[PDB]
Amino acid sequence: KYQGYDVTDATHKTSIHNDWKVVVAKKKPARGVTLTIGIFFDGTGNNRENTASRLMKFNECSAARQGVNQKDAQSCEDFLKEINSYRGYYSNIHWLNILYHPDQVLKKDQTSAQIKTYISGIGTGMGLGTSILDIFEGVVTKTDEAMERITQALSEFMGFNLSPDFCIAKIQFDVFGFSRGAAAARHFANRVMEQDPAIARAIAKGLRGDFYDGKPSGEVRFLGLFDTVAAIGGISNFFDINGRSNPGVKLELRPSVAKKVFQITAMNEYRYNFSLNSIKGMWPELALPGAHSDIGGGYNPVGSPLQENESLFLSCPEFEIVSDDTREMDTRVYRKAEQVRKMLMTLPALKHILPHGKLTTKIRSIGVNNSNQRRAGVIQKQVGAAVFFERMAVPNDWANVCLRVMLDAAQEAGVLFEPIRQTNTELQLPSELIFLADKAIAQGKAVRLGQEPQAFTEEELYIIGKYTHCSANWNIESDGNLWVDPTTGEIFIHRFGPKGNKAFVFPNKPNDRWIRSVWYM
Amino acid sequence: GGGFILTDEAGVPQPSTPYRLTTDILQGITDENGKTAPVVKVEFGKVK
């Protein structure tokens, strides 16, 4: 169906003759090769989150939107400091990229090839508002970066194959994302479904004008999503930038968006700033025990210097001033904290995470300087109470199980992956997690075959609870680049530099009632 | 100036072959008489 021309002589002389020279070339059969471009949209990885993303998390989660005045917020910070930025680890998109089989030089008979592309995560005074708007619109910008990276990958592939003997008969895409690369991935897939002209432009600029058959913007073979969170934070309450409209992110996956679509979902992700965009009911979706970065990866190993140790406020710390004679355990804040602790000890959301650490109510008592009451003889103390969870050396081995489930789904879809070998010791599963991984893989098959997965038993869910991180907490963070109105909760970016104040956010605050917000399609 | 003309081993010009003429790159597709755009070595692509 395709034809090329073998050229004996292919050079000529320029002049004022402007002579046209025949170039006799014989007509050679040309292979039709199906070229698949693996698009890998990461979240955060072995990187820290930039200031703009962390400040976006202030939206709806600042200490002012909660009933936490600035004095109480500084007391929360002091409390946490007295009881006890973050860089993540390689995600599962990193490992899928490393394991995605790359084709560099095709064989004499090879009619299908794979090339791969890696796009980083969205988060990785004057500019600060523009930076937060860039993160807010990060999904579409990352799909544009994906187009440029597609051009680069096509250039590299056709630079490994000089004087081609083949025509690219089809351009396929295997799009993989972790959460903000997942919305981006979905957005990218929609741009491929809408046959975006920028995709065809990138394919042409990478093939350097070479003819490729098929849809000019390509087709998506497999869509692999790890935990779709379209936005982590917001800009609605930022006075400076809330005027900008929502980004035109397309997250709905219609039955022709791809040939196979698979999502894994975190069953124990409960944060407010991490709400799920689910494909359940329309496409195969597997809910798997774990947190957000226990499904998509991103937690450092047990023995690293960046080991994940959880010292977490599981209740918002509450402070009140009382008489110094009053017993700390006879205080309203202590009663509230104990109520929260007994609620969490029965909550099914943390049923399997709490038995692997110690859950306590922690009390802080400081003195309160009130000279007026000192003259009356009344000495006063500020008593604060919170619920604390302490767990040490949380293993990150459940994201390898989620990796293997996504690998099984993609390999069913037709994607070629290099085997997971003993050479990869970062991907090797503990014995405790070996059989469970098989079960998880089987569960994936069940959701892919349309059936219902055989759920993990409570003993199995306990063993998995060794490996799932508690990502929702009431730990307070601060920044000096914002001022939040104590009454309205509106955020005002310090456009001329920090003013010496501290604005307080609960970045990883749980969703209300400890139930994650799910947006279905 | 000048250009190329693509023909088979037997003299039938090839109408819509892609080409890349490099001196800077001038891409294009040959005309009905298998003629490049006026402008060097030419690389000819593939046809359906």
Beta strand pairing status for A276-278 and A518-520?
Answer: parallel
Residues of chain A with C-beta less than 8 angstroms from the C-beta of B27 = 208-209
Residues of chain A with C-beta less than 8 angstroms from the C-beta of B4 = 12, 20-23
Helix, strand, or coil here: A303? coil
Backbone dihedral angles phi then psi of residue A182, each to the nearest 5 degrees: -85, -45
Half-sphere exposure of A116 (CA within 13 A, CB side): 19
Taking the Cβ of residue B37 and every Cβ of chain A, the question of whether any pair is shorter than 8 Å is answered with no
Q: Among candidates B36, B33, B48, B28, which has minimal Cα distance to B2? A: B36
- Helical residues (DSSP H) of A33-125, grouped into ranges: 51-56, 70-83, 92-99
Q: Among candidates A62, A51, A44, which has minimal Cα distance to A509? A: A62
CB contact under 8 A, B46 and A167: yes
Residue type, A357: G
**Nearest residue of chain B to residue A18 (CA atoms):** B2
Backbone dihedral angles phi then psi of residue A427, each to the nearest 5 degrees: -115, 5
CB atoms near residue A77 (< 10 Å):
18
Taking the Cβ of residue A204 and every Cβ of chain B, the question of whether any pair is shorter than 8 Å is answered with no
Which of B7, B20, B25 is nearest residue A22 as measured by Cβ atoms? B7
CB contact under 8 A, B41 and A10: yes
CB atoms near residue A355 (< 10 Å):
14
Q: How was this structure determined?
A: cryo-EM
**A208, A158 contact by CB (below 8 A):** yes
Q: Which two tokens stand for residue A397?
A: 């081995």
Which of B5, B14, B18 is nearest residue A21 as measured by Cβ atoms? B5
| DSSP conformation letters of A486-513 | TTT--EEE-TTS--S--EEE-TTPBPGG
- Angle (CA) A94-A98-A102 rounded to 5° is 135
CA A176 from centroid of its chain's CA atoms = 11
**A476, A77 contact by CB (below 8 A):** yes
Domain hosting B37: range is 1-48
- Helical residues (DSSP H) of chain B, grouped into ranges: none
CB contact under 8 A, B46 and A209: no
Query: How many angstroms separate the most distant Cα atoms in chain B?
Result: 31
Residues of chain A with C-beta less than 8 angstroms from the C-beta of B8 = 24-27
Q: Among candidates A226, A140, A146, A118, which has minimal Cα distance to A178? A: A226
Residues of chain B with C-beta less than 8 angstroms from the C-beta of A17 = 1-2
Which of B7, B38, B40 is nearest residue A18 as measured by Cβ atoms? B38
Q: Among candidates A233, A247, A181, which has minimal Cα distance to A55? A: A233
Q: Is the dihedral of CA A463, A466, A471, A474 positive or negative?
A: positive
Domain ranges within chain A, ordered by starting residue: 1-66+85-309+393-521, 67-84+310-392
Taking the Cβ of residue A164 and every Cβ of chain B, the question of whether any pair is shorter than 8 Å is answered with yes
Q: Among candidates A201, A173, A170, which has minimal Cα distance to A258? A: A173
Distances (CA, A) of A448 to A99, A203, A443: 22, 31, 9
Name the strands in the sheet holding B41-44, side by side, starting at the edge strand that comes first in the sequence: B25-29, B18-22, B41-44
Q: Among candidates A40, A173, A89, which has minimal Cα distance to A400? A: A89
- Within A228-372, strands assigned E span 260-266, 276-278, 285-288, 310-313, 318-323, 358-368
d(CA A261, CA A222): 6
Q: How far is A207 from chain B (nearest CA, A)?
A: 11
The total domain count for chain B is 1
Identify any residues that bridge with A24 across adjacent strands, giving them in sequence order: B7
Taking the Cβ of residue B44 and every Cβ of chain A, the question of whether any pair is shorter than 8 Å is answered with yes
PDB resolution in Å: 2.6
CB pairs under 8 A between A and B: 103
Backbone dihedral angles phi then psi of residue A45, each to the nearest 5 degrees: -130, -130
Distances (CA, A) of A350 to A225, A374, A416, A503: 25, 45, 37, 30
- Angle (CA) A147-A151-A153 rounded to 5° is 110
Residue carrying structure tokens 């040939």? A259
Half-sphere exposure of A485 (CA within 13 A, CB side): 9
Taking the Cβ of residue B20 and every Cβ of chain A, the question of whether any pair is shorter than 8 Å is answered with yes
